[PDB]
Amino acid sequence: GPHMATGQDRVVALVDMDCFFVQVEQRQNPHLRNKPCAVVQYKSWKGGGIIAVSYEARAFGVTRSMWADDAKKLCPDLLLAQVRESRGKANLTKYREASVEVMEIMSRFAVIERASIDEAYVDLTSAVQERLQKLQGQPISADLLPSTYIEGLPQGPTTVQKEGMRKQGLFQWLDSLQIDNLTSPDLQLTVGAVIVEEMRAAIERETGFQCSAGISHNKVLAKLACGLNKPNRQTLVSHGSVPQLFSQMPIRKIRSLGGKLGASVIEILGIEYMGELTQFTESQLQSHFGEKNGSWLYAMCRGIEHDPVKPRQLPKTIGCSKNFPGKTALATREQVQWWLLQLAQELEERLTKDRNDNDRVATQLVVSIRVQGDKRLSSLRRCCALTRYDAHKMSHDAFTVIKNCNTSGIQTEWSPPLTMLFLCATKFSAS
DNA sequence: ATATGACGCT
DNA sequence: AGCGTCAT
Numbered sequence: 001g002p003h004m005a006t007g008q009d010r011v012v013a014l015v016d017m018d019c020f021f022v023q024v025e026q027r028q029n030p031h032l033r034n035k036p037c038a039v040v041q042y043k044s045w046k047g048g049g050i051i052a053v054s055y056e057a058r059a060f061g062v063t064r065s066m067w068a069d070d071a072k073k074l075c076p077d078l079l080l081a082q083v084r085e086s087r088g089k090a091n092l093t094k095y096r097e098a099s100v101e102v103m104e105i106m107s108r109f110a111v112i113e114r115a116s117i118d119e120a121y122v123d124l125t126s127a128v129q130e131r132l133q134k135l136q137g138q139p140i141s142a143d144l145l146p147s148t149y150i151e152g153l154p155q156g157p158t159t160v161q162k163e164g165m166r167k168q169g170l171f172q173w174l175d176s177l178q179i180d181n182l183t184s185p186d187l188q189l190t191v192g193a194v195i196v197e198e199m200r201a202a203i204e205r206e207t208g209f210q211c212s213a214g215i216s217h218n219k220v221l222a223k224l225a226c227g228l229n230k231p232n233r234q235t236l237v238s239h240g241s242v243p244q245l246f247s248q249m250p251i252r253k254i255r256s257l258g259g260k261l262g263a264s265v266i267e268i269l270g271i272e273y274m275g276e277l278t279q280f281t282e283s284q285l286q287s288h289f290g291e292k293n294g295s296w297l298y299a300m301c302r303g304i305e306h307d308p309v310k311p312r313q314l315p316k317t318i319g320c321s322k323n324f325p326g327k328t329a330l331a332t333r334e335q336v337q338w339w340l341l342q343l344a345q346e347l348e349e350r351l352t353k354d355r356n357d358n359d360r361v362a363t364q365l366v367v368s369i370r371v372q373g374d375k376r377l378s379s380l381r382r383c384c385a386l387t388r389y390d391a392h393k394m395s396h397d398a399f400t401v402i403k404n405c406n407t408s409g410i411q412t413e414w415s416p417p418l419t420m421l422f423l424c425a426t427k428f429s430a431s
Numbered sequence: 432a433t434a435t436g437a438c439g440c441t
Numbered sequence: 442a443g444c445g446t447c448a449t
């Protein structure tokens with residue numbers, strides 16, 4: 001009762017760009033706008049692999065990881081943009097740079113944690129408090145929330161179109177707001193949503209890109225909220241909406257529960273939905289999933305999560321990687337050394353840019369490879385000192401640290417063949 | 432035969 | 442350190 005914390009201390013948002021690489025390509029090429037479109041990587045094998053899909057093309061069933069030749073079977077008018085290729089590999093610079101455009105705009109409103117190339121969490125607690133002093137108990141007009149959904153509303157006893165439903169739920173939400181209570185969690189969320197509308201308007205105004213957002217009390221709910229009404233909309237998930245929302249929410253939809261841990265929860269406990277977790281004690285959950293996971297699950301199924309928005313807008317590693325599938329697996333020493341060089345040359349370019357831009361230098365080089373037949377992402381990881389941003393030195397050091405993995409008795413030959421090379425610069429210090 | 436990035440475990 | 446997990 002009086003002493004049970006409810007996880008309502010923060011306002012946290014997750015902003016995620018809508019079909020991000022497609023929007024980047026559509027900005028650059030007006031002929032792709034308002035069309036079924038996808039961004040494709042390489043070309044020779046089955047037309048290349050799709051990595052981003054416009055919402056018009058999703059309506060035909062086109063998805064990420066689909067081959068372009070297969071996507072065209074679903075959607076014959078599909079337009080395609082190709083990822084740039086440099087040094088024989090995909091080169092993602094255009095998207096990294098568009099990401100920086102978005103992150104710098106968001107960083108004007110609050111401290112952000114970059115969570116992917118296209119999304120960032122926002123700790124809005126301070127901004128909300130400041131905005132709540134300036135408002136001075138004035139009601140929040142629905143005009144301030146033109147793209148906001150209130151999860152769980154409209155409800156109860158009292159319209160057959162999407163936007164009408166949205167507005168009816170928003171009116172019900174606003175009409176129940178205690179606007180005199182500067183500490184009401186629901187009011188704080190609402191003001192947070194007002195700020196995220198402003199943030200998303202600025203992103204769209206200054207970049208042309210549209211995005212979605214979730215606003216809630218923690219990162220997990222904000223991320224979940226964000227996807228509820230993609231694209232080009234934001235969703236507020238209140239603490240009070242959690243029981244109904246979680247009562248039919250598959251466990252795998254919750255961030256970090258999408259893999260083996262979430263599958264074990266389902267299998268060991270005999271449950272399907274996040275809300276069913278409330279029936280177990282914290283000790284029970286810890287007994288099955290370990291001390292940290294059990295505690296985390298106990299709170300999370302009640303909508304409570306305390307992972308902070310870390311103040312970090314820049315990645316902390318800089319890495320280059322390429323897979324060599326099937327018959328293209330690297331099978332000679334010279335092949336391995338040539339591709340390590342291509343990777344090292346792109347890495348040097350990104351590192352040199354990183355040092356001038358962000359006043360830091362990497363100090364460790366991590367070399368990861370995958371051998372043919374191994375289902376793991378990485379078969380082997382070794383590291384060495386990164387002392388000079390010099391591609392030939394880096395590629396040579398990388399070969400040095402992996403070269404003993406070659407079981408071939410022949411010098412020119414590499415065995416077992418390599419299906420992935422990966423160079424990652426890490427352990428940055430200020431410069 | 433689908434390029435990366437963060438963090439956990441021992 | 443080197444591998445395992447989850448993610449976009």
Ligand SMILES: Nc1ncnc2c1ncn2[C@H]1C[C@H](O)[C@@H](COP(=O)(O)NP(=O)(O)OP(=O)(O)O)O1
Nearest residue numbers: 016017018019020021022051052053117118230449
């Ligand atoms: N496995 C992957 N491999 C390569 N690139 C990927 C990728 N997953 C995502 N990307 C790249 C391409 C993606 O555009 C970008 C952001 O990924 P999302 O936010 O997960 N998906 P999007 O923003 O496209 O659409 P929406 O959010 O509206 O659903 O990262």
Ligand SMILES: [Mg+2]
Nearest residue numbers: 016017018118
């Ligand atoms: Mg996205």
Ligand SMILES: [Mg+2]
Nearest residue numbers: 016116118119
């Ligand atoms: Mg994303």
